[PDB]
Amino acid sequence: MNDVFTRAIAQADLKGSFLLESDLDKLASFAKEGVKRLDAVAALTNNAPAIISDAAHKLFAEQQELIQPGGNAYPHRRMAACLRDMEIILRYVSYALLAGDASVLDDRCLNGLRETYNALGTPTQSVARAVQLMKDAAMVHLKSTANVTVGDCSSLYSEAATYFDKAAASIA
Amino acid sequence: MNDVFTRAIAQADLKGSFLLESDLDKLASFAKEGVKRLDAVAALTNNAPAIISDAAHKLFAEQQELIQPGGNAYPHRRMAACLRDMEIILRYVSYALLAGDASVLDDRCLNGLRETYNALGTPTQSVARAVQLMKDAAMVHLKSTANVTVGDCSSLYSEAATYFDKAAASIA
Amino acid sequence: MNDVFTRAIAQADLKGSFLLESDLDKLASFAKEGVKRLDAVAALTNNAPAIISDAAHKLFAEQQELIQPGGNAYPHRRMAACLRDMEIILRYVSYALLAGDASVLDDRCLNGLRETYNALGTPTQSVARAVQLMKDAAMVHLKSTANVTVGDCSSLYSEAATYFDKAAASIA
Amino acid sequence: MNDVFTRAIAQADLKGSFLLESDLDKLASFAKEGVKRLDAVAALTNNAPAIISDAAHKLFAEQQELIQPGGNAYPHRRMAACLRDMEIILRYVSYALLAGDASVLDDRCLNGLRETYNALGTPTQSVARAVQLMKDAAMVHLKSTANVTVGDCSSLYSEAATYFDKAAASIA
Amino acid sequence: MNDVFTRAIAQADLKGSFLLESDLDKLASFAKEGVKRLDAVAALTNNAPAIISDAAHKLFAEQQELIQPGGNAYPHRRMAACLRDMEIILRYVSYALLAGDASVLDDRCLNGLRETYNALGTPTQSVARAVQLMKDAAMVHLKSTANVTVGDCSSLYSEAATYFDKAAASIA
Amino acid sequence: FLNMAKDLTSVSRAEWLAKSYTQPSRYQQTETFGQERIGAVGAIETPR
Amino acid sequence: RIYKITVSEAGAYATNKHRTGYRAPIRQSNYTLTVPYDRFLPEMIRLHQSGAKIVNVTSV
Amino acid sequence: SRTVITEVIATADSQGRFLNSTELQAAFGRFERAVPAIEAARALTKNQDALVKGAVQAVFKKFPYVTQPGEKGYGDSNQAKCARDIGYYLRFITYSLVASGTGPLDDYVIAGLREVNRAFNLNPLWYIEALNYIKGETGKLLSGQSKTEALLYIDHAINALS
Amino acid sequence: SRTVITEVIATADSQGRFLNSTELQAAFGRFERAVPAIEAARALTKNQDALVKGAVQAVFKKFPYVTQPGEKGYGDSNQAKCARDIGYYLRFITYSLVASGTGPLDDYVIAGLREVNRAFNLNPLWYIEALNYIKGETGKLLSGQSKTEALLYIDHAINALS
Amino acid sequence: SRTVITEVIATADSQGRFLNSTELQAAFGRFERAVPAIEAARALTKNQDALVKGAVQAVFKKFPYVTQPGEKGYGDSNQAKCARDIGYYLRFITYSLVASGTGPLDDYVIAGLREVNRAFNLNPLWYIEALNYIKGETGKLLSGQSKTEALLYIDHAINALS
Amino acid sequence: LDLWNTQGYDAEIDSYVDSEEYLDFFGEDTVPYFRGFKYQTGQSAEGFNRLVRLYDGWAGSDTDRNVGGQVARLTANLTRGGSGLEPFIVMANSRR
Ligand SMILES: CCC1=C(C)/C(=C/C2=NC(=C\c3[nH]c(/C=C4\NC(=O)[C@H](C)[C@H]4CC)c(C)c3CCC(=O)O)/C(CCC(=O)O)=C2C)NC1=O
Ligand SMILES: CCC1=C(C)/C(=C/C2=NC(=C\c3[nH]c(/C=C4\NC(=O)[C@H](C)[C@H]4CC)c(C)c3CCC(=O)O)/C(CCC(=O)O)=C2C)NC1=O
Ligand SMILES: CCC1=C(C)/C(=C/C2=NC(=C\c3[nH]c(/C=C4\NC(=O)[C@H](C)[C@H]4CC)c(C)c3CCC(=O)O)/C(CCC(=O)O)=C2C)NC1=O
Ligand SMILES: CCC1=C(C)/C(=C/C2=NC(=C\c3[nH]c(/C=C4\NC(=O)[C@H](C)[C@H]4CC)c(C)c3CCC(=O)O)/C(CCC(=O)O)=C2C)NC1=O
Ligand SMILES: CCC1=C(C)/C(=C/C2=NC(=C\c3[nH]c(/C=C4\NC(=O)[C@H](C)[C@H]4CC)c(C)c3CCC(=O)O)/C(CCC(=O)O)=C2C)NC1=O
Ligand SMILES: CCC1=C(C)/C(=C/C2=NC(=C\c3[nH]c(/C=C4\NC(=O)[C@H](C)[C@H]4CC)c(C)c3CCC(=O)O)/C(CCC(=O)O)=C2C)NC1=O
Ligand SMILES: CCC1=C(C)/C(=C/C2=NC(=C\c3[nH]c(/C=C4\NC(=O)[C@H](C)[C@H]4CC)c(C)c3CCC(=O)O)/C(CCC(=O)O)=C2C)NC1=O
Ligand SMILES: CCC1=C(C)/C(=C/C2=NC(=C\c3[nH]c(/C=C4\NC(=O)[C@H](C)[C@H]4CC)c(C)c3CCC(=O)O)/C(CCC(=O)O)=C2C)NC1=O
Ligand SMILES: CCC1=C(C)/C(=C/C2=NC(=C\c3[nH]c(/C=C4\NC(=O)[C@H](C)[C@H]4CC)c(C)c3CCC(=O)O)/C(CCC(=O)O)=C2C)NC1=O
Ligand SMILES: CCC1=C(C)/C(=C/C2=NC(=C\c3[nH]c(/C=C4\NC(=O)[C@H](C)[C@H]4CC)c(C)c3CCC(=O)O)/C(CCC(=O)O)=C2C)NC1=O
Ligand SMILES: CCC1=C(C)/C(=C/C2=NC(=C\c3[nH]c(/C=C4\NC(=O)[C@H](C)[C@H]4CC)c(C)c3CCC(=O)O)/C(CCC(=O)O)=C2C)NC1=O
């Protein structure tokens, strides 16, 4: 697994050199911003069931074919698997947000997920759509100012969005 | 693993509808000749060693290439593996006869068998010949009128022939 | 796995034949010259650390790129794995020298090894170079007439050379 | 662990004789009562959550010290273990009632159940009282004649009471 | 797991001193007469089923109660277990004979056998009788002066008798 | 045809059948054939 | 906590092995296994299903 | 789905043996009592309309606190897919009757029931009330073995919901 | 021994759950079929001596060689053991009929049959031919479903011995 | 196949280590015993036809009841297969002698022996008699140690059959 | 997957090790070994092939240091149940 620090160390090792002063400065900035990062990750974690439920409601209102007999979220079992997968993906996105690196998301969650869904008959376009709805709900919660000290956290927003849309791109 | 009842339910559920009146009539008919179907399955189970032995005798008479030094069934170990395979395939045929559908046969016995034989270097033509000889030795015991009430079971004979032929066409 | 005797038996069984007088003479000669084979195997076994250290020093003198940052033996883990590989290859070559057949090498040592290195990214030219260096280091210990009854053992030198060559050829 | 028929066969073989005519008559009487027995065990398995819930309500009304902090039904973890243990006991009671033998109860849990409860320090008298409450609820649900044809089953209630008593007496 | 040499080395190491010349002479004698040891072990092995069959016939002629229903060797599987246990004892006795040390028999076969039989309900005295009967049949087969050059092997006979008697004593 | 005739008629049928049964097969398969193909000779002959 | 379960087999395990056949190498009957609390119940059920006899359980 | 036939074939396959006498006897029992089960299935399919409407009305009577605004039963769509859910339960109960095994129920409704009901905040007691009503008029619609066979599956679904 | 009710209970305890509809299914089938099975057990019990003597003579018929001096069937003790063994087989058939499951058969003859017979040089074909004798005899001696019940267990014994 | 050298290498390899003193001393024993074993194989190969004919004749003398019409020992095909089987056994005995291990026997004959003999109803006693014959004439054919090795291997085959 | 998701990694390992399969074949004292190179009762005829696919030879490993990563091998075969060419094999074994 990799976080931002460990990737930096990895390229430095590939060159065989120490870490330059600019790289150390970037890592210092990261660690300074780490408390905002923790707030973002806790917003994702704390409000997770709400995010999953909102995404599910929007997705199954948009795509009613998924919940008709013959749909891919029709019986209770397939619906449970659908909600489980959405929870899993959001959970690995929160991991990547804390780590500052999308490595765990790729290695664990999106390692072979497109071929999995293709073999299952699962519409990967709809899975990507669910990831987008989860992203929207997550941004609604992460921009919330209640119970945090106000500040600029746009870099965290953009990075969270990149994790979400990277998941959606790997799936579809 | 599907029988006729569960296959009918699966189709009815893809349609999203209750079982139709004609569907219930067909399933009631199936349950009606269930007793003759059980007679056939008992005929196959009670006479398995004779079926296998007859098939083996004819098979090794026809293809003596198989049991000479160098043949694929030559040493005691590989000959025992040959007889074991014959018993397995006959067992799955009897299962398919009981269930009324070949789903168990294809799924649990045939889907990868041919490429298993190719991987091991086993002549698939000879295995198909053995299965055909098993079909022959099984029809004779299957029609045996002794010990059971006299009646009509030509549909059952055709169904069992289809199972054996599907095994032989899959393996070959 | 086979020795020379089992290789001969396997070839005779393909003919359904007993072992010929000539082949039995070859096997008897192999057995009578077995003390020399034992001494050669003891030479490989007893001098294994010397052989591997010599080969490693020469290999990393010739190819400095293997031990730079980014090389295939850079961190301690990759160098440890390299030394393990060399020890394993020498161990199996000694097994083959005792057995008299390269079967142990093909069945175990070189079974999935080229694909292993290819998937890892190991330069197989360098592995074959290490194996050749080990061959050079091992010939000097095989040929050492100190502390052993002097005689003609050129056949054993040639056989060990061919086993090292078979390893190197399978790699590269 | 053996059924009433297998029990009778057990004594018959211990004396080595064929089954006596009186013992055969008893087994036939049991097989005649069998349908009543299936109605009884279906009553037990059918109403199990209600039986457990009522027994628990009463047991923790008559014994609050299990509910208080520092009690043995406290916290959620221990309370869930209590509910699960009543579940398992009722399951085994139904098993014994269908089997008609009492040793299928003693060889399943009661053999080590007491030693377990002494290791954990659980008050065995409370577990016995819970089983007795379960017995009362089971007789209440057993005697219900709705949706089943009417008839005497006094032997079945007696046997169920004996099995509940055996559980509550082997634990305590 | 020891032999005569390893046991002697163990005592030598407990005293902390080199092996004495008397000990060296004793072990050189043991290795010089080890040819007779190999003959005795081969005689034990080649005739193992004959020994077991003879001992079983003798034991079941004498102890007739085992065969009858309710006896320990009545159920046909229990006869199989009796035969298996006899073969295991013979195998470990031959192991100990080849080693020259009884520790391999004890530590691996006899240490728990008493408790096993007692937990089972097997009569240990009949097992000891079976071991002695095996000792008699084995003595008959080892003393067979045919097939080997005639020689004095009273030490081997005594050693085998000691192993059989010690196995019997540990069993009962 | 004279050779075929001599083999058929001149000699007894017993040794004829015996030699026909021991003729080397056209499948030239050793016992370990099939395990060498899938590469699992070692994985099978390892000691338990 | 951790609990030590002393196991015995007096014939139910024996007859199960007789039906199925010896399938891993044979072993002596009486033996003891240490089990944590989390694995305590499944191990107990497994022993009961196998026909095993537990003579005592100790808590430590 | 796991039915009598599927169960016996599975237990025969796992042990690697031909179907023995006990399994054949069980299969014969299933075949014989198909007829009451299919009669029950025909009865329930024919009466499905009044069945589902009565069940929804029973749910509303027992939980009048669900139809007010701000709650689950409020709305026309929520009504319609209440009826849709009860129709699902009825259809899978008829599937269970026809198949002479609870496999359709397990596979289609029971497998994954709790987490779905938790995710969408569906009270299982709503559905237990609906199925208890259906249980009530099964006696009105069914008789003999047919009634008990249908009751078995209705109780199984209620137990799983419990 | 593992019989129909016993297999029900073992399957239910293996999955840690109750007795469901299918297990009640099998139990009802066994309980209703007990009557032909137990009448067959009675008939086999009353005719035990005639059957065992007929089967003993059948073995001496199809294997004339076993009886000459120096062979296994020669001697009064050996033929007494023959009679006792055929009686054992018949008794376990009747036990399996009563239990309505081959559990008695499996556990009392089948388990350990092959290696015991190997050890004592008993040919399984002797007992196969004897059991074929009992099969033919009971085909006449039994009427209706009881004939099927006896013959299925006899053929299971044949399949085991073969 | 399982020989001295192959067992040595397998044990060394399973523990991931080179060949030490113990293993080389075992191989040394193999290389010494090669001489008696190889020339015992030579003597057995030379007299193969007489040995096979005598073994078949001994089988028929001990089992006269096979050769009359209707069973296994009747017919030219059956007797030819008998000669083929005894030649197989002798071939693999000589193979095992040369290889100095029961690997050829264990791998080609003994593995699967009982299942195959059961399936084709071949009595192991026939082959036991044939091998006991082979033992009788290898007693007089061979002297000193060669007799000893050939007897060890013949008896390993016998034991496997019994 | 559901087991790991709902009960964690340890319960997932315990399922393998507390399984009846493990105890039948390895049972508390023998090291696990590759069974699937022989027919196992209840096998699906693609289990042999899936093991041959998973097995890489004696000198093969399951390392996560391979160039592309540690990647799945049997997903399509598992979900599909096979190659998906069998109906066409049946068609071919008819006329042509
Ligand atoms: C136990 C887990 C844990 C958490 C949750 C945690 C959060 C945390 N947030 C902090 C402040 C802060 N938190 C935020 C982030 C918020 N501000 C904006 O509203 C954004 C919407 C949002 C980002 C997603 C900001 C901007 C600060 C001010 C400090 C700074 O900007 O460096 C601080 C510093 C002290 C303070 O000002 O309260 C901490 C320790 N620390 C922990 O150990
Ligand atoms: C122990 C488990 C069990 C078995 C095995 C079983 C078979 C069985 N099938 C029966 C009827 C029958 N069985 C057959 C089958 C035969 N007829 C043809 O000659 C074929 C050669 C052959 C089948 C291929 C037929 C045609 C009937 C009559 C159908 C009917 O009952 O209307 C009957 C007698 C019922 C009667 O006729 O009144 C039995 C006992 N029943 C069981 O409970
Ligand atoms: C404990 C392990 C063990 C070992 C190591 C062993 C080796 C061994 N080497 C021997 C002699 C010998 N050793 C050699 C081999 C040497 N000739 C050349 O110098 C080469 C450098 C080298 C071999 C590559 C030769 C040629 C003989 C003489 C035997 C002959 O020529 O036939 C002998 C027989 C002694 C004699 O000459 O009478 C043995 C037993 N035996 C064992 O049991
Ligand atoms: C395999 C056969 C079997 C046995 C031997 C068994 C008894 C049993 N009870 C246990 C715990 C327990 N059992 C209870 C029972 C409750 N305590 C009282 O208040 C109630 C009256 C009573 C209800 C019956 C409690 C509270 C615990 C938790 C003990 C603790 O953690 O402190 C445990 C340990 C659970 C674990 O560690 O995972 C077992 C094995 N259940 C079985 O299926
Ligand atoms: C498939 C599962 C199954 C069910 C649903 C079942 C109910 C059932 N009850 C029956 C009769 C009966 N059942 C009972 C038992 C009842 N008497 C009292 O009301 C008690 C509350 C209760 C038992 C504790 C009685 C007394 C009879 C009538 C006596 C008899 O027919 O033997 C019958 C026999 C009617 C027939 O088929 O011809 C059945 C099938 N049996 C089953 O195997
Ligand atoms: C492959 C396995 C193997 C065996 C079996 C084996 C036995 C063996 N027995 C031998 C002779 C002998 N064998 C025996 C055995 C005794 N004779 C009595 O009748 C006793 C009944 C019997 C005890 C069991 C004796 C006493 C000798 C002669 C010892 C001597 O040469 O001084 C010899 C030496 C013959 C020679 O070279 O001159 C050997 C090597 N060696 C082996 O490598
Ligand atoms: C280390 C080697 C080893 C040995 C030797 C050993 C002995 C042993 N003997 C057993 C049963 C048995 N052992 C016997 C044999 C005795 N009873 C008869 O009376 C005979 C006279 C006598 C034989 C000489 C019998 C009859 C049984 C079956 C007991 C039963 O099932 O009730 C069992 C239990 C079988 C099981 O749990 O599956 C063991 C473990 N166990 C081992 O791990
Ligand atoms: C396999 C069979 C199956 C069942 C049983 C099933 C239940 C089910 N009902 C749903 C909708 C729903 N269904 C209900 C139920 C009714 N609403 C109220 O009128 C009543 C009080 C109440 C019933 C008594 C409700 C409240 C929802 C809302 C879920 C949402 O808003 O997303 C949903 C969410 C999918 C959707 O948005 O339509 C499921 C999974 N789904 C299935 O595929
Ligand atoms: C409860 C189940 C059970 C069975 C089935 C069983 C078979 C059996 N029969 C035996 C004796 C025997 N049984 C026979 C039977 C032969 N007699 C000839 O007339 C016929 C050809 C043939 C019978 C068809 C013979 C010859 C023996 C003597 C075996 C010996 O040589 O010691 C023995 C040896 C133990 C003894 O009786 O002392 C066994 C194990 N044992 C059991 O405990
Ligand atoms: C190299 C390992 C190997 C061995 C040992 C072997 C023996 C062997 N011999 C066979 C045939 C046979 N073998 C015999 C032997 C009998 N002939 C009679 O004269 C005697 C009483 C007796 C010999 C002593 C008979 C009768 C058959 C024909 C059985 C049948 O087809 O029904 C068969 C059955 C398959 C076939 O017909 O070819 C095997 C497996 N096969 C092997 O692959
Ligand atoms: C559940 C469905 C299923 C089946 C049927 C199945 C068959 C199967 N047959 C195998 C080997 C074999 N199978 C055969 C049989 C063939 N060769 C003979 O010549 C005949 C022509 C023919 C039989 C009629 C042979 C000889 C082998 C040994 C191949 C070898 O290892 O060299 C193997 C490899 C493992 C082993 O040797 O036991 C499997 C898995 N596997 C399955 O999972």
Residue numbers in the entry:
A (entry chain X), B (entry chain W), C (entry chain Y), D (entry chain U), E (entry chain T): 1 to 172
F (entry chain 3): 291 to 338
G (entry chain Z): 17 to 76
H (entry chain O), I (entry chain N), J (entry chain S): 2 to 163
K (entry chain 3): 436 to 531
Give sentences from the paper.
Phycobilisomes (PBS) are antenna megacomplexes that transfer energy to photosystems II and I in thylakoids. Here we show the cryo-EM structure at a global resolution of 2.9 Å of the 5.9-MDa PBS from Anthocerotibacter panamensis (hereafter A. panamensis), a recently discovered Gloeobacterial species that diverged from Gloeobacter spp. around 1.4 billion years ago. The A. panamensis PBS features a configuration comprising two herein characterized linkers and presents a paddle-shaped morphology.
For the bottom pentacylindrical portion of the core, two common CpcG linkers tether the Rb and Rb’ PC hexamers to the A/A’ cylinders, whereas, at the top, an unusual combination of CpcJ and CpcN is used. Two CpcJ linkers connect four side PC hexamers (Rs1/Rs2 and Rs1’/Rs2’) to the D/D’ cylinders via the inter-domain linker. Although previous studies proposed CpcJ as a linker in Gv742128–30, our study is the first to demonstrate its function structurally. The bilins at Rt1’I (CpcN) and Rs2’I (CpcJ) have longer bilin distances to the core (36.0 Å and 35.9 Å). In contrast, bilins at Rs1’I (CpcJ) and Rb’I (CpcG) have shorter distances to the core (27.6 Å and 25.1 Å). The CpcG-mediated PC hexamers Rb’I show the shortest bilin distance to the core, suggesting the highest energy transfer efficiency. The differential bilin distances from PC hexamers to the core generated by the three linkers could be a selection target to eliminate the less-efficient CpcN and CpcJ linkers during the evolution to crown Cyanobacteria.
